[PDB]
Design a protein around this ligand. Structure first.
Ligand SMILES: CC(C)[C@H](NC(=O)[C@H](OCc1ccccc1)[C@H](O)[C@@H](O)[C@@H](OCc1ccccc1)C(=O)N[C@H](C(=O)NCc1ccccn1)C(C)C)C(=O)NCc1ccccn1
Lengths: 99, 99
């Protein structure tokens, strides 16, 4: 679909059989989700944002459905204010910026 | 144009007679630029994201040129490590997310 930006570009995503709201963020290299349980082993990663850096848990090859489009990739879990869908998954669903 | 997200969507902007590189950021409510001098009176503001909050200076009615398109809006100036063009200005140039 086509999403304007007068409001936050929030979409519904499905992960671990649960529905959550997440922000489509072209300014994020990675996808960062709020604290939750995911399968498998995780690796450590440090990511930087506007306020500085935070420590997150990296899970690989995670299945996530964004607005009905299935994607399988890396997801970071940590103290983020909101769920963020980054470029790593936006490219998987063919998302582009237009103007 | 149509911008893909394989790489960070960086563009050239013009503000106060200066050419700067900025990130088209759909995950940003506001536009935040690295420390610089702007005309007029400003108001202090606290903005947050990944990592926490930072104190910035808020300037209103600022003219910015983005890839040729002129836009007017509020611009925040502060210790951000990267220049960010947020939704307040992305809307003015007719920017949308598509997939
Ligand atoms: C791991 C990624 C998260 C990271 N990218 C960013 O931090 C982007 O910023 C560019 C950026 C990149 C590096 C350093 C600083 C800035 C984001 O899009 C950012 O803009 C946005 O974050 C998502 C978000 C949305 C809503 C609430 C909280 C958080 C955010 O902080 N939005 C704020 C916002 O809208 N806040 C609203 C709010 C809601 C609730 C509570 C408080 N505030 C704005 C005021 C900035 C990244 O790619 N680092 C690699 C990287 C890239 C380049 C250089 C170095 N590393």
């Amino acid at each position: 679909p086509q999403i304007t930006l007068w409001q936050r570009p929030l979409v519904t995503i499905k992960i671990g059989g649960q529905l959550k709201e997440a922000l489509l963020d072209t300014g994020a290299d990675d996808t960062v989700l709020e604290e939750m349980s995911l399968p498998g082993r995780w690796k450590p990663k440090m990511i930087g944002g506007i306020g500085g850096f935070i420590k997150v848990r990296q899970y690989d090859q995670i299945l996530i459905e964004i607005c009905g489009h299935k994607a399988i990739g890396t997801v970071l879990v940590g103290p983020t204010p909101v769920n963020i869908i980054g470029r790593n998954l936006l490219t998987q669903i063919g998302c582009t910026l237009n103007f």
